[PDB]
């Protein structure tokens, strides 16, 4: 089997992205954040706080006849950016473009963090990073790559995700027509439960590459590309009026400013990140300060690959016995 759905950024930043998920019998459509750095399929629901729930679209599992409360079990997961969720958990049918599995944990929130209730676009989360990260307890629970994973015609999912536009999560297939040139494969290590991979190296705009090794995850559901001080210094310094504010919390830049293209290693390859794809708008409405898109790692522990990098890239997830990521140009 595969599957293929369309994913569409939530703002005109590209602060995230949602992609359509059936839950059911019938069929309540939620628009999830597929992440590849979280292991937890959870959704607003009819057991939401009320006070907690602000436009999302919510599950009722007293609607499906395929839902099924897993007796005793209970979530609950902090998010790298301070936000959390709770609740408990039902099985049931759960549908990602065509591809469907029976039986997927289906974790109902029963309280959100005020970040999740005032975005009301984002309806749940569809976790992609290893089943060994999901917070089920008593018994742990799989994610929907790894129950459909047997039944794929290869055991793989794809993110395309665009630059203000919208693009797609493949499972089961690559689509050789969605990317430029070949794809390079570089190893994972699944020890913390993420795509933990190792570039091996970087150049700012038009400047020589660097070589060095850089261990960072990649992860749909982080916006931004955090990577050490050193590298994110030797960026921003490319940049004239650029500097690191303490009360913004990260580096800002003048929103005149055109910034240089980033380009990260993969292997012998190299995946370019155009200068737009680093400016995230205005610090406040009206400001002349703007967000950028670099940021350091240095007070996270781990350099992450979000989607500023990530939607540079065509992007293989390869869950074979020993996994892999590949990335090629688009």
Request: hydrophobic share 35%; charged share 10%; aromatic share 12%.
């Amino acid at each position: 089997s595969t599957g293929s759905a369309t994913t569409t950024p939530i703002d005109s930043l590209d602060d995230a992205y949602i992609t359509p998920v059936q839950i059911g019998t019938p069929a309540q459509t939620l628009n999830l954040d597929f992440d590849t750095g979280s292991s937890d399929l959870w959704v607003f629901s009819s057991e939401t706080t009320a006070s907690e729930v602000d436009g999302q679209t919510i599950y009722t599992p007293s609607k499906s006849t395929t839902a099924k409360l897993l007796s005793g079990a209970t979530w609950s997961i902090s998010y790298g950016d301070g936000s959390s969720s709770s609740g408990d958990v039902y099985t049931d049918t759960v549908s990602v473009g065509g591809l469907t599995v029976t039986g997927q944990a289906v974790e109902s929130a029963k309280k959100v963090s005020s970040s999740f209730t005032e975005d009301s676009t984002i309806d749940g989360l569809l976790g992609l990073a290893f089943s060994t990260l999901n917070t089920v307890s008593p018994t742990q629970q799989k994610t929907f790559f790894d129950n459909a994973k047997a039944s794929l015609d290869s055991p793989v999912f794809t993110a395309d995700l665009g630059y203000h536009a919208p693009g797609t999560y493949n499972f089961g297939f690559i689509d050789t027509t969605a990317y430029t040139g070949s794809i390079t494969y570089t190893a994972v290590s699944t020890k913390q439960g993420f795509w933990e991979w190792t570039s091996t190296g970087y150049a700012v705009g038009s400047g020589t590459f660097k070589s060095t090794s850089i261990d960072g995850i990649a992860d749909t559901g982080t916006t931004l590309l955090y990577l050490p001080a050193t590298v994110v210094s030797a960026y921003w310094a490319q940049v004239s009026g650029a500097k690191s504010s303490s009360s913004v919390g990260g580096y800002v830049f003048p929103c005149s400013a055109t910034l240089p293209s980033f380009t990260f290693g993969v292997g012998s390859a190299r995946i370019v990140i155009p200068g737009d794809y680093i400016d995230f708008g205005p610090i406040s409405t009206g400001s002349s300060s703007c967000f950028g898109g670099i940021q350091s790692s240095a007070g996270i522990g781990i350099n992450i690959f979000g989607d500023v990098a990530l939607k540079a890239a065509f992007v293989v997830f390869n869950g074979a016995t020993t996994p892999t990521l590949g990335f090629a140009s688009k």
